[PDB]
Amino acid sequence: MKFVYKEEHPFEKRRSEGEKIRKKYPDRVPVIVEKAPKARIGDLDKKKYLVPSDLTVGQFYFLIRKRIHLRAEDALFFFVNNVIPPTSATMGQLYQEHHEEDFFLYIAYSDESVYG
């Protein structure tokens, strides 16, 4: 899954900025959120988020839904490494399990249940 943020910031700068942002906000995880390419769905103004590490995936669904101006009845799926993460997991658990070597967590969102 291609993230534009990776193409526009080289790995080394990403890594040093992730280190800095984990030090400044130790109880928050930094997350990159991008729309999946083929998804017919609202785009998001910002990509970089600081998220409380005890926030659940469901609560993240709620907040992201608020930001793309979706109704609760409209569909919204998250993907971490092309897999839908469990709704009950915390963002801290997701970070520990799936953070990349630049200290960032990468999440894609779509209106479809399969990434593409």
Binding site: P30, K46, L50, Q59
Partner: peptide, 8 residues
């Protein structure tokens, strides 16, 4: 460029 904090 910056990070947007998200809370409930």
């Amino acid at each position: 460029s910056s990070f947007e904090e998200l809370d409930l």
